[PDB]
Design a binder for this molecule. Structure first.
Ligand SMILES: Nc1ncnc2c1ncn2[C@@H]1O[C@H](COP(=O)(O)O)[C@@H](O)[C@H]1O
Ligand SMILES: Nc1ncnc2c1ncn2[C@@H]1O[C@H](COP(=O)(O)O)[C@@H](O)[C@H]1O
Lengths: 206, 206
């Protein structure tokens, strides 16, 4: 099946076509019907599988544009690293031209991202420490999150972000959709899934 | 997504509609794009999930009708029990009106099934002991199998059918598609997957 065979809106199919993206990878093909229907998913997959679009497409599809100044994000993606935050943000921006994506990460000052968040965002792609700092400063508001994604949960564990990840998830409404990607499923990630996800289907392409 | 949103041929959508089947269950929704594209899948799922159609639909879709007298089956489904063989056969018959499905099982004499097989079949749904007896008698010919399904691999293990299952799979061409369903994945089933499947995606709805 091609991307056009899935329930994806025009601006997304046009964006995909513009980058020569036509045919879902296996994790995308298996995930999309579920994820596009709002269901929670665990994607056991590493980079190279197309896992990013497996969550970025759902986000793109579910979120309609908004121009509301100062608006709070409706999608949150957590990543272990600045590098992956930037990469994921770029990809989401590319498949969701209708959305404002803000990347949040450390190894830099707080001002620029704070001001981006305060201007308004539809999606935030963040490393957990910096995200939690903004949450607790009242700069990042997660009360409107509809889709939360943990991208490389095992790495976030290895880097000691468990408490941050949990605090961030706890700040989002449980009505959300949650997608969890991880190559491995250590017991913390399994617990995270049990606590923060709704009967997720697991798709493993390892 | 509804069944009509997947690449299923008219006789199958008509059959589904005739039974009021419209919307894939989660394992179906995740499996179909992969399975309809010929890919191998492990479905970690128990009865109640819709796992049967997750493999019966692919079989139905891939196999065009044939009227060839004495033809050898192009699909093989192995089940642990007579009861499940009969149930799966019934379901496959119902979604594949264009195919002749033969159930093979023990606890009965050999004549009736032998004669059914010799008349020709498109799909055989069998328990492993009886299937292997027919194979070795030269009555069941598996050289044309295009789709093999292990349905409840863990149960087939628990009932001591490992050697039979392996012999049967070994008799099918490796060019086939293989689908393996099992609630649990004991090491024999994992080995079976490694040996007899091609990079399968695992979908777990447990
Ligand atoms: N469906 C697709 N078709 C072609 N390339 C893809 C597709 N999905 C993702 N990619 C590329 O696959 C690579 C790995 O993606 P990921 O596994 O998300 O890190 C990236 O270079 C993506 O641009
Ligand atoms: N997509 C579906 N919609 C409604 N009922 C279904 C669907 N797929 C399977 N069923 C029913 O689900 C039950 C369990 O199927 P299984 O898990 O394959 O044993 C059976 O009663 C099937 O008829």
């Amino acid at each position: 099946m091609e991307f056009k065979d899935f329930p994806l809106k025009p601006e997304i199919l046009e964006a995909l076509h513009g980058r020569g993206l036509t045919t879902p990878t296996p994790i995308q093909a298996a995930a999309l019907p579920l994820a596009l229907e709002g269901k929670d998913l665990i994607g056991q997959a590493r980079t190279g599988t197309g896992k990013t679009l497996a969550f970025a497409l759902p986000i793109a599809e579910r979120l309609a544009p908004s121009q509301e100044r100062g608006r709070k994000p409706r999608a949150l993606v957590l990543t272990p690293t600045r590098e992956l935050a930037l990469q994921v943000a770029s990809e989401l921006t590319a498949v969701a031209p209708h959305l404002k994506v803000v990347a949040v990460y450390g190894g830099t000052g707080y001002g620029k991202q704070k001001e981006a968040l305060l201007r308004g965002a539809d999606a935030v792609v963040a490393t957990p420490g910096r995200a939690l700092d903004y949450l607790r400063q009242g700069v990042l508001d997660l009360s409107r999150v509809e889709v939360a994604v943990l991208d490389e949960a095992d790495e976030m564990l290895s880097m000691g972000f468990e408490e941050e990840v949990e605090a961030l998830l706890s700040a989002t409404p449980p009505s959300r959709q949650t997608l969890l990607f991880s190559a491995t499923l250590p017991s913390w990630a399994k617990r995270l899934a049990e606590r923060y996800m709704k009967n997720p289907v697991l798709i493993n392409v390892i």
